[PDB]
Amino acid sequence: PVLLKSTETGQYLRINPDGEVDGTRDRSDVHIQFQISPEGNGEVLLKSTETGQYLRINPDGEVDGTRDRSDVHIQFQISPEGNGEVLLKSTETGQYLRINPDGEVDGTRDRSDVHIQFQISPE
């Protein structure tokens, strides 16, 4: 039961019931609630608690949600970077989740992009 907040913009990751993913600063939005579940092998799934959808990063950088638990693109590695921040990385594609200032969420391989840093809050 956690929130995934972009350190740069203060925006929280949100999955809408239509599968669309964006960011919002509204901490009261029920759609920003996530459950992180272990896969064991160092990977986790990032599941929207209110809709049951897993975050997915597609190879073309598009981020959405699916309930398809067989999908290889829902697998993530959470990795420290520094100062209690983490990166949320797609195992299969090497892409980091990114929240842009306009609230649009996508994936990028640019390790130095300032918008890939997250704070996980246990809320």
Side-chain angles (χ1 to χ4, degrees), residues 2-20:
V2 305
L3 314 180
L4 308 174
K5 185 165 96 172
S6 155
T7 57
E8 281 287 306
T9 62
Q11 296 173 111
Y12 298 95
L13 195 72
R14 173 169 64 181
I15 312 195
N16 309 267
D18 66 347
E20 289 174 28

Side-chain angles (χ1 to χ4, degrees), residues 62-73:
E62 281 186 281
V63 174
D64 64 354
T66 175
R67 301 187 182 93
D68 180 13
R69 147 162 230 160
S70 76
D71 194 305
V72 316
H73 299 105

Side-chain angles (χ1 to χ4, degrees), residues 83-102:
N83 311 99
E85 315 186 319
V86 305
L87 313 180
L88 303 175
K89 184 181 169 168
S90 156
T91 305
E92 296 306 309
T93 69
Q95 283 174 108
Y96 300 105
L97 197 72
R98 179 162 66 175
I99 309 188
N100 301 277
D102 68 357

Side-chain angles (χ1 to χ4, degrees), residues 10 13 45-46 51 54 58 66 81 89 94 96 107 109 117:
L13 195 72
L45 307 183
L46 301 180
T51 69
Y54 303 100
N58 307 274
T66 175
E81 176 180 50
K89 184 181 169 168
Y96 300 105
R109 299 201 184 89
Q117 276 80 16

Side-chain angles (χ1 to χ4, degrees), residues 15-69:
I15 312 195
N16 309 267
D18 66 347
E20 289 174 28
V21 178
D22 65 351
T24 177
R25 301 190 176 91
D26 182 356
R27 200 192 172 93
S28 76
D29 194 319
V30 302
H31 299 105
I32 71 168
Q33 307 288 332
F34 281 88
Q35 192 202 316
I36 302 176
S37 55
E39 291 282 85
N41 56 0
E43 299 176 300
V44 307
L45 307 183
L46 301 180
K47 189 177 173 302
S48 151
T49 67
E50 296 296 319
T51 69
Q53 296 172 100
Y54 303 100
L55 204 68
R56 169 163 72 183
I57 312 187
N58 307 274
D60 74 343
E62 281 186 281
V63 174
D64 64 354
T66 175
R67 301 187 182 93
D68 180 13
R69 147 162 230 160

